[PDB]
Design a protein around this ligand. Structure first.
Ligand SMILES: CC1CCN(Cc2c[nH]c3ccccc23)CC1
Length: 149
């Protein structure tokens, strides 16, 4: 897989993260991110995708050593951590063909795993609209503990 880059944007209180809602195959909520172009540096791809998806420019706030990186089915995903962005910021994409909605969500209320169907004696997972965000939630809570406490 071609690696992906983007951002976990947090507010001033560190309670809330900014998620985006796509369409079709991307129909639930996730962190803003996308596929790197040939020759493009990681930090630049991250700023481009977030600006295309949210209308907010992160270039002057990115710290090159502050990110969470996951491998998901042999595709690397890296999200730069961007704290302290005010909750009254107005977010407006270019691409409204791709993004249904943008919202702040409480970190303590987001799931860190999907629920089984063990009450139905059935295998697999129940659907969850946060499916794409889920893998980052526990590593984010751990990173915020270490960095801030
Ligand atoms: C955080 C608040 C709720 C999100 N809003 C912007 C927004 C919501 N949905 C969208 C779809 C396309 C383009 C922009 C938007 C800013 C204030």
């Amino acid at each position: 897989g071609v690696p992906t880059y983007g951002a976990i944007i947090l507010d001033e209180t560190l309670e809330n993260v900014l998620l985006v809602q796509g369409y079709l195959a991307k129909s639930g909520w996730g962190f803003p991110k996308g596929k790197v172009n040939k020759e493009e540096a990681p930090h630049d791809c991250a700023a481009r995708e977030v600006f295309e998806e949210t209308g907010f420019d992160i270039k002057d706030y990115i710290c090159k050593d502050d990110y969470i990186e996951l491998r998901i089915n042999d595709q690397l995903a890296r999200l730069y951590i961007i704290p302290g962005i005010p909750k009254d910021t107005k977010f407006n994409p270019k691409t409204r063909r791709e993004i249904r909605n943008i919202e702040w969500f409480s970190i303590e209320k987001l799931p860190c795993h999907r629920n089984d169907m063990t009450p139905k004696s059935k295998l697999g997972l129940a659907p969850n609209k946060f499916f794409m965000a889920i893998p980052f939630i526990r590593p984010l809570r751990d990173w915020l503990s270490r960095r801030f406490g």
